[PDB]
Design a protein around this motif. Structure first.
Motif, PDB file in Angstrom:
ATOM      1  N   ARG A 178       0.822  -1.203   0.000  1.00  0.00           N
ATOM      2  CA  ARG A 178       0.000   0.000   0.000  1.00  0.00           C
ATOM      3  C   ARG A 178       0.859   1.258   0.000  1.00  0.00           C
ATOM      4  O   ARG A 178       0.575   2.211  -0.740  1.00  0.00           O
ATOM      5  N   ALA A 195       3.976   1.681  -1.060  1.00  0.00           N
ATOM      6  CA  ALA A 195       4.657   1.854  -2.336  1.00  0.00           C
ATOM      7  C   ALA A 195       3.701   2.370  -3.406  1.00  0.00           C
ATOM      8  O   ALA A 195       4.096   3.168  -4.260  1.00  0.00           O
ATOM      9  N   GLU A 217       4.043   5.914  -5.547  1.00  0.00           N
ATOM     10  CA  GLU A 217       4.072   5.924  -7.003  1.00  0.00           C
ATOM     11  C   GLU A 217       3.106   6.957  -7.569  1.00  0.00           C
ATOM     12  O   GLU A 217       3.454   7.715  -8.484  1.00  0.00           O
ATOM     13  N   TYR A 218       1.883   7.005  -7.030  1.00  0.00           N
ATOM     14  CA  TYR A 218       0.889   7.941  -7.550  1.00  0.00           C
ATOM     15  C   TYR A 218       1.303   9.379  -7.293  1.00  0.00           C
ATOM     16  O   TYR A 218       1.139  10.238  -8.164  1.00  0.00           O
ATOM     17  N   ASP A 267       8.312  12.685 -10.791  1.00  0.00           N
ATOM     18  CA  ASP A 267       8.966  12.316 -12.038  1.00  0.00           C
ATOM     19  C   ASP A 267       8.148  12.881 -13.197  1.00  0.00           C
ATOM     20  O   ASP A 267       7.072  12.371 -13.519  1.00  0.00           O
ATOM     21  N   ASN A 307       6.661  10.534 -16.260  1.00  0.00           N
ATOM     22  CA  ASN A 307       5.492   9.662 -16.168  1.00  0.00           C
ATOM     23  C   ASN A 307       4.325  10.468 -15.606  1.00  0.00           C
ATOM     24  O   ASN A 307       3.847  10.204 -14.494  1.00  0.00           O
TER      25      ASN A 307
END
Ligand SMILES: COC(=O)c1cc(O)c2cc(NC(=O)NCCCNC(=N)NC[C@H]3O[C@@H](n4cnc5c(N)ncnc54)[C@H](O)[C@@H]3O)ccc2c1
Ligand SMILES: COC(=O)c1cc(O)c2cc(NC(=O)NCCCNC(=N)NC[C@H]3O[C@@H](n4cnc5c(N)ncnc54)[C@H](O)[C@@H]3O)ccc2c1
Ligand SMILES: COC(=O)c1cc(O)c2cc(NC(=O)NCCCNC(=N)NC[C@H]3O[C@@H](n4cnc5c(N)ncnc54)[C@H](O)[C@@H]3O)ccc2c1
Ligand SMILES: COC(=O)c1cc(O)c2cc(NC(=O)NCCCNC(=N)NC[C@H]3O[C@@H](n4cnc5c(N)ncnc54)[C@H](O)[C@@H]3O)ccc2c1
Lengths: 343, 362, 362, 343
Positions: free
Chosen positions: B193, B195, B199-200, B334, B337
């Motif tokens: 959860r 990670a 990421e989002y 980032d 992406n």
């Protein structure tokens, strides 16, 4: 020098494995309940194929198929994954107390070293139209680790093709291309590129779903038996077809979908992406003819769909079709790496 | 070459493949704000082009070179590194301009131009202005610029402003909470959860929004393309001091940008601000991992630091603190992406924007 | 009275208010399986009613009393405790049956019937058969039954069976994960995530489903209304030993029920099984907090214990274990707060039900 | 003997507070982003009304409004809640490290003892049509704890009513009632109850949303000023109306919605449930006439909407309306406790 590096441009493998390194993409595959649940029941209903057996999981991603093999009773599961998702699989193995049964091995299955042979290989290697992404070749390559009596899940794959009529889809792509028919766009004449634009737009496979009503003939089938086939069988795939037209009208192209079967000792379970079945993240695939063919009921539409594998982990597709009674012929090239997602 | 030293082949392959598609050129051309504004800027400054020598960096289909021809340019060198260069040549022949437009296939960092030029034209802007790192190729191209020469566009303004958008922020946790379940098909996913949340949040959000979600007057960072060197865009530091005009939870910073074509006859602006018509650059929002409470009159201060990477993008570091309270937040994003969130739906106004009865306004 | 000793006023107020609405009567009457089957059972056993004395417990609109009249009953005492009793009287007058049907307003535990009866008719079934605890009023009514008398319905069969439904199970965690976010409008909600999960799992799920989600032949528990005493329904123990026919994750137990009208002429069945046409009782599923893995051939065993409460419902305790593995699960459910999940959509079949190619079947 | 117990049947308070004891119901209120976000910005934009002030939260539920007052700077917040949700609010206060500023006091605000007077009361007391559930009376009752200079959030409430035309809605309810028109349902004559059934069905308020197009006149407004009003003002509410008809057609009833205003020192913020605004969990409310009234443009439709409070925490509604030019009169009784949710 490894089998994967020879057949794959590095610039394509980098993007490919970065794409599958994102958890969000793992979530999207996992949330396909038809996909995930069908794999789980194929495995559990054939528990005897797994009980106390050694398993290899090709491209395990988050590791979800390995956990299914563990639930089935597998003694040991080697879960190979080349993307950075391998690290996340390791985390789940530890937090599910399966460190003694699931062993994540980071790397390309063509390059890693496995400590022993396995009784059964599992994988989800299917792309759009089944063959996209060329992961079926890694799946077949991994048979070097398969015992002679071994099995494979999935065991076979059936590609289905059928001609369709859909003038709306055809006009949508022609209308996009007709942007380049203009003689004075902001004073500039674009018309010389009208031909190149139509070629580009119609070499695009259309990925979305459709009603069976648009199919004009019983479907033609092409089978790959994963137990029997070699890696080199998929570099040049030749699919002849002879359709008996059941309705008259304009044939605007060929629609593709696929089925795979898990042939276990206890029962066979099918996973289908057909337009008559619930939608999956493979959808269906349609290749358009730049010019439609007319056919009346009872005519035969025949030709060949040739897929030549390329170094971008995809296929150059050549579809040639003709209405035999009239000799009306259509010839097309489709670039499976640049699809048009319409859903 | 300068381009290959700063760019991994993987990124350049995908990048120039993308722009080789006519469908992509057409998408840029069909942005009327973009294409009309460039046309007006060039034609309404015809003196800057009449009988001049021109360099078009990344000409694509060639459309900007044709505008320079319409303005009276004697000679135009149109450099394009994708395979689109061959289609631009076709357009140059069919428009009978082979004697005025010369298409030079290749990267502007690597090709040879047969003479200096009086003006450089280009559309090097990416998301948040800087994305794709083509501004460096635009600046590199000044080796061909006569000392008196000009650049179209001439300057670029990046604007940052704090926003409040509870829904955008909660959406990240709703998506990640897919992994917070103990028996997904018999598997406990919850260790991932955290990670998934990270990421989002590393993703800049590309979509548009209602300007009433902004809580302070924007802060401007300017690049002058006449003065700026390639090396200036490797590390871009944007300090900010926002004076809050509304109270609320600051969920991140919103980015947009303007460019100006400063000609001898007039200055034309191309704006991607949220107050202007939407373009294919939209706007960009970078979330804070933890929101900051601010009341009107408070000051919100920090730094946006953009560090170029070899994937033709930037790592974004945002640090911010409410000075009155010391409350602090950061984030790393980032820019390569992004998350494309645009739905097509008119952005809905922030709740609590009605200062008068909506039932009376009926 | 017996009714007031076992029922909190709050529950009885709401309960008899609900059945006072004609809209509610109409909903029951418009269930054709229900109303047609009762009519057939009564009329096709006309000898059990011809010139007999009848008691209709909870007659509502009176519809079952009218069927008994159509069958030839001499006298019918129609007891109803809601205000619907006054509307049933109206129907008795307008149908010219005042000499054969007598409406007695009140609870059957409290009213006075002027004589014994030969047969009792009623529709006392709730969800899972037992919900609403009206079966006890039906049994209590046997104080008015002649020794030779009969009951319509005569017996009730509750059926339980294990099911697998990954989506139903994961839905609970998806709903509760609303609370697993650290900044809902600046508030950390996550301490309540566990309480939200528990709340959802305590809810029996009222909807229907595809029978292929069942993993074992059902187990039957029978109540014989001729023999059973009121006290037998305060504590109902249903042991079960399931022999698994499919491998998978058992996510809970599914409940449905049948009743039989055993007349002198024939036995008529009213079934709410998932293999029969849907009724307004649907089916009921009680989830396990943690699913159990079972392979075909394994045995799943445990007990379903229903403890009556004063809110006219039951606390449900389910304990189950896979005998081959010792793997165990429980759950406590409140039958008074069911979750109505029925959408109207035909239930979708379990994934992996295709043993032959669906593309060939085209 | 407490003000709440006198005006409330116990059987209605039990169900009422059990309903708000479920977390799922708290989630549904909270997930209304217009509701939750408008409360939050009314409070934060008027931070000076809260900075270092003492706050009372009437019926705090999960406690979310108290957390907004804490974010605004409140020194102390007394969060009163009579359902078992109080225990869950306590958990959130502890886990958000606000034990020194938010004090949950379990019980009915009419019955509990508060240690001091407060500068500002906050609450979400509005039901369907504003007045349903009779929580506005507890909100007003809590002014015994309000300092003389004190404020209230919300400060005022505006009920709006307007005649509407919607023959589909009218026929849907008439069609349901016409079940009881049958002379031989399974051989039984139901027709004698046809009248009672129409009465029951049309005493139901219809809760859902609708387009403004169906409104036939500018809306009439009735204001409650929460700073000024007494508890007893809401036992008998008389709303006269005189509509100037702007379109001809059948008037099938009156549509109700409401607005509340947060009148703070720094600005006024409005929360609206109007059909022109985004949907909230209050929707809008329509009361149907058993028989429609005809009116032409320029006619006046006049009458009175009388709400008499009852012991089931609701209102007996009496709506009498007449077209003045023709004397066409319609008289109706609506039972606000048994609505018809149509959404
Ligand atoms: C460019 O943008 C577009 O227009 C586009 C184009 C496409 O063709 C797309 C196409 C899209 N396609 C899917 O929707 N795909 C999901 C189903 C298959 N998912 C799966 N589980 N299979 C792969 C896994 O296997 C690993 N893996 C592969 N090869 C090896 C090896 N040699 N060794 C070890 N691991 C290996 C991988 O890393 C993965 O862990 C989506 C989006 C797409 C988007
Ligand atoms: C992966 O999926 C995502 O989430 C995603 C991520 C992105 O960063 C994207 C990002 C997206 N991009 C744009 O937003 N595009 C429009 C902006 C304006 N268009 C432009 N900037 N075009 C430059 C032209 O100039 C040429 N050119 C460059 N460099 C040189 C050089 N050195 N020499 C000669 N020619 C050169 C190029 O080939 C072009 O002919 C889209 C989609 C994107 C999608
Ligand atoms: C809160 O929201 C929810 O989630 C919910 C929960 C429930 O438990 C529900 C549950 C729901 N219920 C049914 O499923 N209903 C249909 C089953 C058949 N109908 C029936 N069982 N009707 C009995 C009649 O008999 C009368 N009667 C009872 N006792 C006595 C007595 N002692 N004396 C005389 N008359 C008596 C009654 O007034 C009636 O005239 C619906 C909706 C429900 C909704
Ligand atoms: C019967 O089934 C139907 O047909 C039906 C009928 C209705 O009228 C409904 C109507 C429905 N209505 C809403 O959708 N409602 C949400 C908006 C208001 N929510 C709110 N926050 N307000 C109340 C809170 O305040 C507390 N509270 C009240 N009084 C006191 C007091 N004296 N002391 C202390 N606390 C008190 C309560 O316990 C709550 O914590 C839904 C469903 C409904 C369903």
């Amino acid at each position: 020098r490894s089998v994967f590096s020879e057949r794959t441009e590095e610039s394509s493998a980098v993007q490919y494995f970065q794409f599958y390194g994102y958890l969000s993409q793992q979530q999207n595959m996992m949330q396909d309940y038809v996909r995930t649940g069908t794999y789980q029941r194929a495995i559990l209903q054939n528990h005897t194929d797994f009980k106390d057996k050694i398993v290899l999981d090709v491209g395990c991603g988050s590791g979800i198929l390995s956990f299914f093999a563990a639930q089935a009773g597998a003694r040991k599961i080697y879960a190979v994954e080349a993307s950075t998702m391998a690290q996340h699989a390791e985390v789940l193995v530890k937090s599910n107390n399966l460190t003694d049964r699931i062993v994540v091995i980071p790397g390309k299955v063509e390059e890693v070293s496995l400590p022993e042979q396995v009784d059964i290989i599992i994988s989800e290697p299917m792309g759009y139209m089944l063959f996209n992404e060329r992961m079926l070749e890694s799946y077949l390559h991994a048979k070097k680790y398969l015992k002679p009596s071994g099995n494979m899940f999935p065991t076979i794959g059936d590609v289905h093709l059928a001609p369709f009529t859909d003038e709306q889809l055809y006009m949508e792509q022609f209308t996009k291309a007709n942007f380049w028919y203009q003689p004075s766009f902001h004073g500039v004449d674009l018309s010389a590129l009208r031909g190149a634009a139509v070629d580009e737009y119609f070499r695009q496979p259309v990925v979305d779903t459709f009603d069976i009503r648009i199919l004009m003939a019983k479907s033609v089938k092409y089978t790959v038996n994963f137990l029997e086939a070699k890696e080199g069988d998929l570099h040049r795939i030749e699919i002849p077809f002879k359709f008996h037209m059941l309705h008259s009208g304009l044939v605007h192209g060929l629609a593709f979908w696929f089925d795979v079967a898990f042939i276990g000792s206890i029962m066979t379970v099918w996973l289908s992406t057909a337009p008559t079945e619930p939608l999956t993240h493979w959808y269906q695939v349609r290749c358009l003819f730049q010019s439609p063919l007319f056919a009346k009921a009872g005519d035969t539409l025949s030709g060949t769909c040739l897929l030549i594998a390329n170094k971008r982990q995809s296929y150059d597709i050549s579809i040639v079709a003709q209405v035999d009674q009239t000799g009306s012929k259509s010839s097309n090239l489709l670039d499976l790496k640049n699809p048009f997602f319409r859903y």
